[PDB]
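agent> Task received from the user: take the single chain below, predict its 3D structure, and emit structure tokens. No templates, no multimer pairing.
agent> Plan: (1) validate residues, (2) run structure prediction, (3) serialize to tokens, (4) report one or two observations.
agent> Step 1 OK, no nonstandard residues flagged.
tool_call: predict_structure(input=
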Amino acid sequence: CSCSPVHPQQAFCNADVVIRTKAVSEKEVDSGNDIYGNPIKRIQYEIKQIKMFKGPEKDIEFIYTAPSSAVCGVSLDVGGKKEYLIAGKAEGDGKMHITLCDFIVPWDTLSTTQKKSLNHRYQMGCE
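)
tool_result: status=success, residues=127
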């Protein structure tokens, strides 16, 4: 989608599952073509789970995102990044939804506004 990632705060207020997990493995699961005839594809995120700031109690060792370098996500392979607090609307437990336009960072980047939001449970009426 080549969306534009921003909201250095509205990202942690929109998400619903912040976990500093680490995506090392994935799963190329087709998702059919889009409205452009192009293949969707929603590569998985067989992370290893290292942290779970906000979200469920178990964890989402299997997240969902877009393939390639990152069209609708951050495409994390760990071997290129490390770990991320991946925080998005989520999809429940054991699996959620995360996109580039959505709140997602390798953690080792944030800046502050994202950290101050890391303290909050889940959108503590921040802004």
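agent> Step 4: summary for the user.
The beta strands are 44-46, 62-64.
agent> Done.
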